[PDB]
Amino acid sequence: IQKLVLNISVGESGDRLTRAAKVLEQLSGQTPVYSIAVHVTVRGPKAEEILERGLKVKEYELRRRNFSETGNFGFGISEHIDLGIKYDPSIGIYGMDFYCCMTRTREETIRWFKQRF
Amino acid sequence: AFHKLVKNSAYYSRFQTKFKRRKTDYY
Amino acid sequence: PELAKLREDKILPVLKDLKSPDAKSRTTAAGAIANIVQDAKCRKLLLREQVVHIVLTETLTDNNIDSRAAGWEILKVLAQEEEADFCVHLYRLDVLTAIEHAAKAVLETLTTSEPPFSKLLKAQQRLVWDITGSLLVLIGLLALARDEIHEAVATKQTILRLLFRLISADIAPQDIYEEAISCLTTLSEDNLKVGQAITDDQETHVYDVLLKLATGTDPRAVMACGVLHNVFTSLQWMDHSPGKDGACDAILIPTLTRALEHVVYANITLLALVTLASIGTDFQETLVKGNSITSEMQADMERVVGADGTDDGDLEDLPTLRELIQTAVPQLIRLSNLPIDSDESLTIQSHALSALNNISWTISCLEFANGENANIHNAWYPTAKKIWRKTILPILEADSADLKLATQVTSLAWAVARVLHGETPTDGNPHRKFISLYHSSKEDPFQGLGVKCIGVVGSLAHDPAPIEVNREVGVFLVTLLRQSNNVPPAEIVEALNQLFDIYGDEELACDKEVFWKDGFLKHLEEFLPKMRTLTKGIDKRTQPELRTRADEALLNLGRFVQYKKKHA
């Protein structure tokens, strides 16, 4: 129930990586993290915001496997623009990884999702 | 039900927009 | 006639002046002649005046470089304005030899260390560049004109060597460099000896040069990609069987995509799009031959990556496809969408369309029934959907402009539908738009739009489609059948097959709610004989494909009406 972790990976060090970073920055407001891959974790307000906003994109229809035995879940999107962020041709398009960890199981979290959203 | 077809990929093979090389004018 | 009289008055002396065994009088005269020779009507006389012969025969062998250079320009200009036959004639006099010699000479000049090239007079080297220019062009047109010529050219080793020499050294003018790059592109396309010549070149290693170029940030990277792609496919460096250093087709796709990122040079854009489309048909070949934050939290995050993942894939063996999907198709869509404002982006759209069309038709040809190719299906389905909504509605919501673009986006929609199958989104009731297009649009046999509309429409009408959607569509097909009096036979085969694919399972709601409720099986028993007549009324020899197709359709219809009874 803590953090939302958006995640990008670009095997090619370079332009395309500093651009992925820029996206995660302006989208979370936090200066992103680096790993071959960038990502950023967001807690509290912005998390529920960015979560729903891309969950929109996925038409609120998931599959049952993405949820972890630890009752967590995630999904991918390929167009970080389908969430109302414009297109900067000096940035291009990037895909994003979305991941939601719950605390206070799979069953309980699936059911939790069904109730709210 | 059930059905009979053969070599289908060949059939729809054609649809792929196909290209080969080759103009401009006015100077 | 009269026009010709005034023409000969103007022209004849110039030829006689070139003809002059005043090789310098004609350095100035021949030097004049290309300018003189640009004119359209006038040329046909010039040709008929046997210029081709003279030039070939005399001018090129002269000791003064200005002669030969004027003469090679003459030929160039000619071949450009004129038509393909012309080149084929030149090939008959084996101008190839004449060129091979010419290129040897240029090659000695560049590679020489005695004069040597760089320390040449300014206009000296300008002359060489002028000669090279014409030479390049000629090889372009000649290769293009016919196949047997394209082969004949990729056999003259000196020619290849020169093309490599230039592309590799990059010490010539950009108009010349780019011309060389093109020339190689033509020769390298669906040709093996050239594929190998470029890879197997250790003299200048033109390969590694291209790779670097198509890999980095250079403004010309795309061109490099065009050649390299032609090579990969020519010698089958693909996913199932990569080249040296895993040089698969895939590695190109990033740079191509980045060339797209900027559009919102212009030629550079079109070229990349064209490449990407070819990559589409060529991975058809791939699939054919194939068969407080850190650490283990990340490790686990790989637990959810099972879900089709944006960033990287299950597809370690098919990087080409993932790069297409992961990187290419985003931009392909955006370009397919963005405004129709000029004719330039009208073209760019028609292209981005052609590309997505290609990719999609390739994949849609695979097997996915049951769990077949699950991984591929799981990567593609999302994208196929996205394409559908993102690019197939908007153009249909516009009802805007063109006819052949309608064919484009219809063909594409067919592909996407072939995969989606009733899982395909329904908004603004598109099946009606297409049906309308079928009736309003009322060659090669199966290129006609009616076919493509039958196809996409019957595709999206599988279970679990909205039962009403299913109904209307099935109705349209059966309608076609009852009034099969003027419908092209191709569309019969497609319609038949569509219904066969939709209503072969009694366990489907539509089987009862639609097929039985509206009693299609009657109309089927009605058409069985009609089908037999039109079938026998088709020429198995001109052409056989259609005939055999209809035959199997009748069998399965014949079989299927019979089967259809089996279940009440």
XYZ file of C-alpha atoms in Angstrom:
712
model
C 0.000 0.000 0.000
C 3.165 2.111 0.018
C 4.709 2.990 -3.371
C 4.004 3.115 -7.084
C 7.086 2.312 -9.147
C 7.141 3.385 -12.775
C 10.024 1.779 -14.716
C 11.938 2.131 -17.984
C 14.914 0.140 -19.424
C 17.030 1.108 -22.444
C 19.872 -1.208 -23.269
C 21.364 1.616 -25.302
C 23.070 4.119 -22.948
C 22.459 7.485 -24.363
C 20.089 10.038 -25.601
C 17.170 7.661 -25.380
C 17.960 6.995 -21.713
C 18.230 10.686 -20.582
C 14.912 11.154 -22.330
C 13.223 8.325 -20.444
C 14.519 9.939 -17.280
C 13.051 13.307 -18.294
C 9.644 11.688 -18.793
C 9.624 10.044 -15.376
C 10.808 13.267 -13.836
C 8.055 15.600 -15.272
C 5.475 12.840 -14.649
C 6.319 12.215 -10.982
C 8.040 15.530 -10.189
C 10.725 13.552 -8.451
C 14.170 13.243 -9.848
C 14.381 9.607 -11.032
C 16.712 6.826 -10.190
C 19.130 5.039 -12.289
C 20.010 1.354 -12.450
C 20.653 0.171 -18.332
C 17.287 1.360 -16.968
C 15.579 4.251 -15.208
C 12.705 4.339 -12.749
C 11.024 6.407 -10.078
C 8.894 5.578 -7.094
C 6.041 7.744 -5.908
C 4.112 7.622 -2.673
C 0.922 9.276 -1.462
C -1.051 11.703 -3.633
C 0.602 11.508 -7.005
C 0.697 7.683 -6.805
C -3.103 7.289 -6.734
C -3.250 9.955 -9.408
C -0.777 8.383 -11.865
C -2.088 4.893 -11.067
C -5.718 5.604 -11.978
C -4.700 7.726 -14.954
C -2.835 4.813 -16.616
C -5.231 2.236 -15.263
C -7.668 4.277 -17.388
C -5.540 3.576 -20.420
C -5.857 -0.231 -19.679
C -9.619 0.216 -19.842
C -9.708 -1.079 -16.230
C -9.454 -4.675 -17.509
C -6.472 -6.758 -16.187
C -5.559 -10.399 -16.122
C -5.248 -12.598 -13.005
C -1.585 -13.516 -13.271
C -0.054 -10.082 -12.951
C -1.171 -10.144 -9.315
C 1.601 -11.630 -7.122
C 1.135 -14.372 -4.488
C 2.096 -11.538 -2.230
C -1.037 -9.931 -3.480
C 0.601 -7.280 -5.509
C 0.133 -6.337 -9.116
C 1.377 -4.608 -12.260
C 0.863 -3.874 -15.939
C 2.617 -2.346 -18.957
C 1.615 0.532 -21.273
C 3.524 1.338 -24.458
C 2.626 4.997 -25.156
C 3.314 7.278 -22.194
C 1.170 9.771 -24.021
C -2.116 7.895 -23.648
C -2.153 9.291 -20.097
C -2.560 12.952 -21.148
C 1.192 13.891 -21.476
C 2.022 15.727 -24.707
C 4.627 14.779 -27.295
C 8.048 16.345 -27.258
C 9.785 15.298 -30.492
C 13.013 15.887 -28.771
C 11.783 13.138 -26.511
C 9.716 10.839 -28.660
C 7.540 8.101 -27.270
C 8.423 5.735 -24.426
C 6.700 2.815 -22.723
C 6.253 2.614 -18.965
C 6.058 -0.109 -16.304
C 3.360 0.242 -13.630
C 3.646 -1.477 -10.162
C 1.465 -1.326 -7.048
C 2.462 -3.084 -3.767
C -0.286 -3.569 -1.182
C -0.070 -3.847 2.642
C -2.089 -2.554 5.605
C -2.618 -11.792 -0.583
C -3.808 -12.216 -4.189
C -7.464 -12.877 -3.346
C -7.780 -9.895 -1.037
C -6.158 -7.489 -3.473
C -8.057 -8.633 -6.545
C -11.269 -8.146 -4.499
C -9.902 -4.784 -3.248
C -9.450 -3.647 -6.826
C -12.964 -4.779 -7.786
C -14.426 -2.629 -4.938
C -12.553 0.605 -5.634
C -11.930 1.743 -9.221
C -17.200 -27.764 -37.255
C -14.150 -28.330 -39.477
C -12.657 -27.043 -42.750
C -10.293 -27.433 -45.707
C -7.720 -24.927 -46.842
C -4.105 -25.029 -48.043
C -1.040 -22.807 -48.459
C -2.925 -19.860 -47.042
C 0.098 -17.657 -46.285
C 0.714 -17.602 -50.036
C -2.831 -16.269 -50.560
C -2.520 -13.260 -48.249
C 1.189 -12.951 -48.966
C 0.199 -10.676 -51.829
C -1.301 -7.945 -49.625
C 1.922 -6.770 -48.046
C 2.552 -3.412 -49.693
C 5.519 -4.220 -51.880
C 8.311 -1.911 -52.923
C 11.063 -1.687 -55.491
C 13.202 1.327 -56.366
C 13.100 4.207 -58.864
C 11.585 10.915 -59.582
C 11.670 14.720 -59.378
C 11.812 17.827 -61.583
C 11.803 21.673 -61.931
C 15.321 22.712 -60.780
C 7.644 17.604 -90.813
C 8.244 21.359 -90.529
C 9.136 21.484 -86.843
C 11.785 18.876 -87.636
C 13.241 21.074 -90.382
C 13.876 23.973 -88.028
C 15.263 21.446 -85.551
C 17.812 19.914 -87.937
C 18.868 23.456 -88.830
C 19.730 24.033 -85.169
C 21.169 20.623 -84.368
C 23.205 19.070 -87.215
C 26.251 21.374 -86.940
C 26.811 20.562 -83.255
C 27.063 16.860 -84.076
C 29.477 17.616 -86.921
C 31.513 19.703 -84.467
C 31.654 16.871 -81.941
C 32.341 14.542 -84.859
C 35.269 16.839 -85.529
C 38.604 15.055 -85.125
C 39.234 18.346 -83.386
C 39.053 16.559 -80.042
C 39.540 19.925 -78.345
C 37.171 21.727 -80.715
C 34.787 19.115 -79.351
C 36.054 19.417 -75.779
C 34.364 22.772 -76.239
C 31.796 21.369 -78.645
C 30.978 18.212 -76.691
C 31.258 20.370 -73.590
C 28.462 22.345 -75.182
C 26.484 19.272 -76.258
C 24.917 18.191 -72.920
C 23.406 21.656 -72.534
C 22.245 21.392 -76.132
C 20.884 17.877 -75.482
C 18.513 18.515 -72.535
C 15.526 19.323 -74.776
C 12.758 16.693 -75.040
C 11.461 16.861 -78.637
C 14.931 17.680 -79.929
C 16.590 14.649 -78.308
C 14.531 12.116 -80.297
C 16.188 13.622 -83.386
C 19.608 13.561 -81.738
C 19.139 9.901 -80.931
C 17.947 9.235 -84.478
C 21.073 11.113 -85.576
C 23.110 8.267 -84.032
C 24.710 10.270 -81.222
C 24.744 7.261 -78.882
C 27.042 5.519 -81.333
C 29.440 8.445 -81.844
C 29.846 9.130 -78.122
C 30.317 5.477 -77.219
C 32.566 5.015 -80.228
C 34.811 8.088 -79.981
C 34.466 10.617 -77.187
C 35.109 8.356 -74.203
C 38.508 7.129 -75.379
C 39.996 10.604 -75.895
C 43.117 11.628 -73.956
C 41.624 14.905 -72.755
C 39.649 14.343 -69.564
C 37.214 17.142 -70.471
C 36.151 15.113 -73.513
C 35.270 11.932 -71.621
C 33.616 13.891 -68.816
C 31.460 15.809 -71.291
C 30.595 12.534 -72.976
C 29.695 10.683 -69.796
C 27.450 13.635 -68.906
C 25.827 13.363 -72.326
C 24.934 9.729 -71.692
C 23.691 10.507 -68.165
C 21.353 13.296 -69.240
C 20.071 11.146 -72.092
C 19.290 8.117 -69.920
C 17.503 10.348 -67.413
C 15.053 12.118 -69.699
C 14.598 9.092 -71.959
C 13.028 5.765 -71.016
C 14.194 2.403 -69.640
C 14.573 0.812 -73.102
C 17.403 3.266 -73.719
C 19.517 1.839 -70.902
C 18.701 -1.677 -72.100
C 20.114 -0.584 -75.457
C 23.288 0.749 -73.846
C 23.621 -2.566 -72.043
C 23.476 -4.183 -75.505
C 26.583 -2.330 -76.595
C 27.960 -3.406 -73.253
C 28.382 0.154 -72.000
C 29.116 -1.794 -68.838
C 32.624 -2.483 -70.158
C 33.066 1.196 -71.001
C 31.960 1.998 -67.443
C 34.105 -0.654 -65.767
C 37.106 0.907 -67.500
C 35.999 4.412 -66.533
C 35.628 3.397 -62.890
C 39.004 1.643 -62.822
C 40.491 4.976 -63.896
C 38.634 6.951 -61.240
C 39.675 4.333 -58.712
C 43.349 4.597 -59.645
C 43.044 8.392 -59.272
C 41.547 8.305 -55.774
C 43.606 5.444 -54.370
C 46.833 6.606 -56.024
C 49.638 7.851 -53.797
C 51.993 9.062 -56.521
C 50.307 12.181 -57.897
C 48.244 11.746 -55.461
C 44.513 12.680 -55.455
C 44.377 15.168 -52.560
C 47.208 17.279 -54.018
C 45.427 17.572 -57.360
C 44.407 20.859 -58.948
C 41.055 22.135 -57.704
C 39.271 21.822 -61.058
C 41.192 18.616 -61.719
C 39.473 16.809 -58.868
C 36.238 18.597 -59.771
C 36.436 16.918 -63.167
C 36.893 13.471 -61.612
C 33.836 14.136 -59.450
C 31.891 15.165 -62.558
C 32.818 11.943 -64.325
C 32.039 9.847 -61.244
C 28.611 11.482 -61.028
C 27.501 10.373 -64.492
C 29.018 6.931 -63.976
C 27.032 6.404 -60.771
C 23.766 7.546 -62.341
C 24.149 5.275 -65.355
C 24.715 2.234 -63.153
C 21.594 3.237 -61.255
C 19.294 3.364 -64.276
C 20.914 0.329 -65.942
C 20.558 -1.869 -62.850
C 16.960 -0.718 -62.395
C 15.886 -1.223 -66.017
C 16.067 -5.011 -66.065
C 17.051 -7.934 -63.856
C 19.635 -9.532 -66.163
C 21.344 -6.130 -66.147
C 21.196 -5.832 -62.353
C 23.042 -9.151 -62.296
C 25.510 -8.155 -65.031
C 26.391 -5.084 -62.973
C 26.827 -6.896 -59.649
C 29.369 -9.018 -61.534
C 31.776 -6.264 -62.599
C 34.051 -6.254 -59.547
C 35.711 -2.906 -60.329
C 32.301 -1.238 -60.025
C 31.582 -2.559 -56.555
C 35.110 -1.699 -55.490
C 34.593 1.920 -56.575
C 31.261 2.198 -54.783
C 32.897 0.880 -51.617
C 35.918 3.148 -52.078
C 33.694 6.247 -52.026
C 31.207 5.255 -49.337
C 34.097 4.193 -47.118
C 36.555 7.086 -47.571
C 33.844 9.778 -47.528
C 36.088 12.388 -49.137
C 33.810 13.249 -52.062
C 30.938 15.770 -52.237
C 27.716 14.923 -50.399
C 25.672 14.914 -53.600
C 28.144 12.288 -54.826
C 28.347 10.381 -51.541
C 24.564 10.148 -51.280
C 24.403 9.093 -54.941
C 26.874 6.287 -54.239
C 24.851 5.171 -51.212
C 21.757 4.968 -53.388
C 23.538 3.069 -56.143
C 24.658 0.473 -53.613
C 21.104 0.282 -52.260
C 19.706 -0.734 -55.661
C 22.394 -3.321 -56.320
C 22.239 -4.692 -52.791
C 18.507 -5.364 -52.940
C 17.446 -9.020 -53.124
C 20.859 -9.806 -54.456
C 23.431 -12.153 -52.994
C 26.723 -11.530 -54.765
C 26.379 -7.940 -53.613
C 25.387 -8.906 -50.089
C 28.563 -10.958 -49.877
C 30.679 -8.329 -51.664
C 29.792 -5.783 -48.975
C 30.204 -8.143 -46.038
C 33.281 -9.893 -47.475
C 35.055 -6.625 -48.232
C 38.223 -6.418 -46.137
C 39.908 -3.916 -48.455
C 37.980 -0.888 -47.223
C 35.593 -2.892 -45.029
C 32.599 -1.030 -46.379
C 30.387 -3.075 -44.051
C 31.733 -1.847 -40.720
C 31.510 1.671 -42.148
C 27.810 1.267 -42.902
C 27.103 -0.346 -39.557
C 28.748 2.534 -37.689
C 26.891 5.019 -39.875
C 23.456 3.426 -39.482
C 24.186 2.978 -35.788
C 25.307 6.433 -34.676
C 23.926 9.966 -34.806
C 25.038 10.858 -38.339
C 22.272 12.549 -40.410
C 22.796 9.890 -43.095
C 22.312 6.869 -40.808
C 18.989 5.975 -42.440
C 20.514 5.473 -45.892
C 23.063 3.085 -44.389
C 20.105 1.219 -42.872
C 18.505 0.861 -46.303
C 21.572 -0.879 -47.709
C 22.297 -2.972 -44.638
C 18.686 -4.117 -44.506
C 18.871 -5.184 -48.152
C 21.969 -7.186 -47.211
C 20.568 -8.903 -44.108
C 17.588 -10.090 -46.110
C 19.697 -10.924 -49.171
C 21.851 -13.380 -47.215
C 19.210 -14.146 -44.576
C 20.699 -12.573 -41.468
C 17.566 -12.866 -39.408
C 16.389 -13.808 -35.922
C 16.572 -17.576 -36.379
C 20.047 -17.301 -37.938
C 21.821 -13.965 -37.202
C 24.876 -12.556 -38.973
C 28.291 -11.691 -37.581
C 27.944 -10.070 -34.155
C 24.253 -10.955 -34.135
C 23.663 -8.475 -36.922
C 19.991 -9.254 -37.276
C 17.573 -7.019 -39.121
C 16.496 -5.733 -35.705
C 19.471 -3.437 -34.972
C 18.353 -1.017 -37.674
C 14.912 -0.319 -36.223
C 16.053 2.034 -33.452
C 17.768 4.536 -35.764
C 14.906 4.315 -38.260
C 12.510 5.057 -35.411
C 14.601 8.000 -34.218
C 14.465 9.399 -37.740
C 10.687 9.369 -37.242
C 10.825 10.969 -33.803
C 11.694 14.354 -35.297
C 9.007 14.814 -37.969
C 6.033 16.865 -36.781
C 15.965 15.309 -45.032
C 12.243 15.129 -45.793
C 13.370 12.381 -48.165
C 15.244 10.766 -45.271
C 11.851 10.441 -43.574
C 10.097 8.689 -46.488
C 13.070 6.348 -46.921
C 13.010 5.116 -43.302
C 9.261 4.477 -43.505
C 9.858 2.491 -46.702
C 12.573 0.437 -45.004
C 10.399 -0.348 -41.992
C 7.698 -1.643 -44.335
C 10.174 -3.962 -46.060
C 11.328 -5.176 -42.642
C 7.674 -6.099 -42.248
C 7.541 -8.529 -45.158
C 10.982 -9.822 -44.397
C 10.305 -10.952 -40.849
C 7.632 -13.018 -42.554
C 10.709 -14.915 -43.682
C 11.893 -15.010 -40.061
C 8.808 -16.799 -38.801
C 8.632 -19.157 -41.771
C 12.148 -20.577 -41.386
C 12.005 -20.469 -37.576
C 9.639 -23.438 -37.416
C 14.590 3.074 0.181
C 14.526 1.391 -3.209
C 16.914 -1.262 -4.477
C 17.701 -4.887 -5.304
C 15.452 -7.946 -5.071
C 12.363 -5.765 -5.105
C 13.509 -5.242 -8.688
C 14.177 -8.993 -8.831
C 10.553 -9.640 -7.890
C 9.267 -6.903 -10.220
C 10.406 -9.387 -12.849
C 7.691 -11.554 -11.287
C 4.904 -9.391 -12.741
C 6.860 -8.969 -16.073
C 5.023 -12.131 -17.073
C 2.256 -9.750 -18.107
C 3.127 -8.434 -21.576
C 5.745 -5.835 -20.733
C 6.425 -2.466 -22.272
C 10.036 -2.205 -21.474
C 11.398 -5.587 -22.478
C 10.210 -8.988 -23.507
C 9.731 -12.707 -23.243
C 10.990 -12.620 -26.843
C 14.730 -13.276 -26.574
C 14.672 -15.193 -29.871
C 12.652 -12.588 -31.769
C 14.235 -9.186 -31.084
C 13.194 -7.952 -34.540
C 9.511 -8.319 -33.728
C 9.784 -6.834 -30.250
C 11.704 -3.824 -31.609
C 8.993 -3.328 -34.240
C 6.252 -3.586 -31.662
C 8.133 -2.067 -28.731
C 9.621 0.861 -30.642
C 8.402 1.183 -34.227
C 4.618 0.872 -34.020
C 4.188 3.722 -31.521
C 5.643 6.209 -34.028
C 3.982 4.456 -36.975
C 0.637 5.136 -35.324
C 1.348 8.733 -34.461
C 2.319 9.429 -38.062
C -0.736 7.539 -39.286
C -2.828 9.909 -37.176
C -1.321 13.385 -37.397
C -2.886 16.048 -39.649
C -3.594 15.767 -43.329
C -2.556 19.384 -43.832
C -0.202 19.138 -46.835
C 0.233 16.543 -49.585
C 3.631 15.767 -48.091
C 2.151 14.385 -44.881
C -0.589 12.861 -47.014
C 2.251 10.793 -48.449
C 3.819 10.228 -45.034
C 0.448 8.933 -43.857
C -0.018 6.653 -46.859
C 3.410 5.298 -45.951
C 3.060 4.864 -42.175
C -0.130 3.072 -43.220
C 1.679 0.814 -45.686
C 4.122 -0.068 -42.910
C 1.550 -1.031 -40.268
C -0.279 -2.853 -43.060
C 2.840 -4.883 -43.803
C 3.747 -5.839 -40.221
C 0.151 -6.678 -39.404
C -0.496 -8.813 -42.475
C 2.725 -10.726 -41.793
C 1.825 -11.624 -38.215
C -1.869 -12.175 -38.949
C -0.818 -15.086 -41.172
C 0.472 -17.159 -38.252
C -1.416 -19.813 -36.336
C -2.841 -18.772 -32.969
C -5.723 -21.229 -32.684
C -5.794 -22.739 -29.203
C -2.591 -21.734 -27.420
C -0.524 -21.620 -30.607
C 2.288 -19.051 -30.696
C 0.980 -17.777 -27.347
C 3.954 -15.478 -26.695
C 3.596 -13.817 -30.098
C -0.157 -13.493 -29.677
C 0.359 -11.973 -26.242
C 2.741 -9.312 -27.568
C 0.719 -8.557 -30.662
C -2.877 -8.529 -29.351
C -2.346 -5.335 -27.308
C -0.733 -3.587 -30.253
C -3.325 -4.877 -32.729
C -6.008 -3.394 -30.491
C -4.160 -0.099 -30.057
C -3.758 0.179 -33.828
C -7.466 -0.561 -34.239
C -8.765 2.186 -31.981
C -5.876 4.603 -32.382
C -5.630 4.569 -36.167
C -8.622 2.745 -37.656
C -11.495 4.695 -36.071
C -10.243 8.320 -36.567
C -9.852 7.814 -40.330
C -13.310 6.209 -40.341
C -14.758 8.954 -38.141
C -13.477 11.475 -40.635
C -15.194 9.835 -43.611
C -12.661 12.213 -45.041
C -11.371 12.316 -48.575
C -9.575 9.657 -50.435
C -10.510 6.420 -52.164
C -7.189 4.555 -52.386
C -6.456 5.558 -48.794
C -9.737 3.825 -48.008
C -8.270 0.719 -49.631
C -5.156 1.118 -47.488
C -6.918 1.465 -44.153
C -9.401 -1.229 -45.196
C -6.634 -3.716 -45.975
C -5.008 -2.862 -42.644
C -8.295 -3.229 -40.756
C -8.638 -6.655 -42.363
C -5.251 -7.697 -40.965
C -6.007 -6.441 -37.452
C -9.412 -8.135 -37.631
C -7.828 -11.438 -38.697
C -6.098 -11.492 -35.324
C -8.637 -9.819 -33.043
C -11.698 -11.917 -33.964
C -14.830 -10.528 -32.298
C -12.627 -9.421 -29.424
C -12.185 -6.460 -31.744
C -13.595 -3.230 -30.196
C -16.965 -1.883 -31.290
C -17.594 1.858 -31.363
C -19.569 3.993 -33.821
C -20.561 0.651 -35.373
C -17.701 0.391 -37.899
C -18.984 -2.780 -39.577
C -21.682 -0.523 -41.010
C -19.147 1.992 -42.364
C -17.328 -0.813 -44.185
C -20.524 -2.373 -45.532
C -21.470 1.073 -46.820
C -18.025 1.261 -48.425
C -18.655 -2.107 -50.057
C -21.869 -0.925 -51.700
C -20.536 2.502 -52.682
C -17.331 1.174 -54.249
C -19.784 -0.694 -56.471
C -7.022 -5.930 -62.343
C -5.633 -8.607 -60.116
C -8.460 -10.936 -59.014
C -8.323 -10.461 -55.206
C -7.216 -6.825 -54.906
C -10.742 -5.428 -55.166
C -12.051 -3.553 -52.134
C -15.245 -5.608 -51.871
C -13.117 -8.573 -50.836
C -11.270 -6.631 -48.141
C -14.548 -5.417 -46.642
C -16.074 -8.905 -46.650
C -12.943 -10.063 -44.847
C -12.568 -7.536 -42.037
C -16.308 -7.507 -41.413
C -16.659 -11.293 -41.209
C -13.600 -11.335 -38.964
C -14.875 -8.980 -36.263
C -18.149 -10.945 -36.228
C -16.770 -14.050 -34.513
C -17.891 -15.012 -31.032
C -17.910 -13.292 -28.547
C -19.158 -10.350 -30.628
C -22.243 -8.404 -29.526
C -25.020 -10.721 -30.679
C -26.576 -7.863 -32.655
C -23.282 -6.996 -34.351
C -22.969 -10.678 -35.226
C -26.517 -10.625 -36.596
C -26.251 -7.627 -38.932
C -22.942 -8.817 -40.364
C -24.006 -12.416 -40.923
C -27.076 -10.906 -42.558
C -24.931 -8.853 -44.949
C -22.923 -11.897 -46.015
C -25.951 -14.116 -46.599
C -27.480 -11.179 -48.478
C -24.479 -11.260 -50.806
C -25.150 -14.963 -51.343
C -28.848 -14.690 -52.230
C -28.138 -11.940 -54.754
C -24.880 -13.468 -56.007
C -25.939 -12.518 -59.539
C -23.381 -9.758 -60.098
C -20.850 -10.351 -57.332
C -17.251 -11.136 -58.380
C -16.336 -14.788 -57.582
C -13.454 -13.769 -55.318
C -15.981 -12.134 -53.009
C -17.942 -15.389 -53.103
C -14.964 -17.347 -51.793
C -14.330 -14.741 -49.095
C -17.995 -14.554 -48.066
C -18.352 -18.339 -47.944
C -15.179 -18.685 -45.894
C -16.263 -15.881 -43.559
C -19.530 -17.595 -42.684
C -17.695 -20.919 -42.369
C -15.376 -19.361 -39.791
C -18.225 -17.721 -37.861
C -20.888 -20.421 -37.641
C -19.036 -23.720 -37.327
C -19.657 -24.181 -33.635
C -23.126 -24.947 -32.338
C -21.793 -24.049 -28.895
C -21.713 -20.395 -29.945
C -24.632 -18.152 -28.963
C -24.803 -16.767 -32.498
C -25.243 -20.272 -33.918
C -28.686 -20.409 -32.329
C -29.628 -16.759 -31.763
C -28.631 -15.788 -35.306
C -27.948 -18.670 -37.696
C -30.952 -20.753 -36.646
C -33.336 -17.954 -35.662
C -32.984 -16.404 -39.109
C -32.589 -19.831 -40.702
C -29.462 -19.223 -42.767
C -29.101 -22.934 -43.567
C -32.056 -22.621 -45.940
C -30.305 -19.895 -47.914
C -27.193 -22.077 -47.907
C -29.065 -25.069 -49.336
C -30.351 -22.468 -51.789
C -26.895 -21.462 -53.011
C -25.272 -24.917 -53.174
C -26.284 -25.412 -56.827
C -25.574 -21.795 -57.834
C -22.111 -22.261 -56.371
C -21.595 -25.416 -58.431
C -22.486 -23.612 -61.659
C -20.297 -20.547 -61.140
C -17.539 -22.882 -59.982
C -17.585 -24.890 -63.208
C -17.827 -21.561 -65.018
C -14.249 -20.670 -64.080
C -11.097 -21.156 -66.179
C -8.739 -23.546 -64.333
C -5.956 -22.546 -66.745
C -6.306 -18.747 -66.721
C -6.295 -18.627 -63.794
C -6.120 -21.814 -61.606
C -5.880 -20.264 -58.097
C -9.422 -18.878 -58.138
C -10.830 -22.159 -59.460
C -9.213 -24.409 -56.855
C -10.184 -21.927 -54.138
C -13.857 -22.018 -55.118
C -13.637 -25.808 -55.305
C -12.521 -26.143 -51.684
C -15.139 -23.553 -50.733
C -17.832 -25.714 -52.335
C -16.532 -28.825 -50.647
C -16.548 -27.214 -47.249
C -19.827 -25.541 -48.083
C -21.012 -28.850 -49.536
C -19.598 -30.568 -46.474
C -20.838 -27.806 -44.203
C -24.400 -27.518 -45.244
C -24.495 -31.299 -44.728
C -22.801 -30.890 -41.348
C -25.122 -27.943 -40.651
C -28.061 -30.320 -40.592
C -26.240 -32.602 -38.112
C -27.214 -30.139 -35.407
C -30.786 -28.845 -35.100
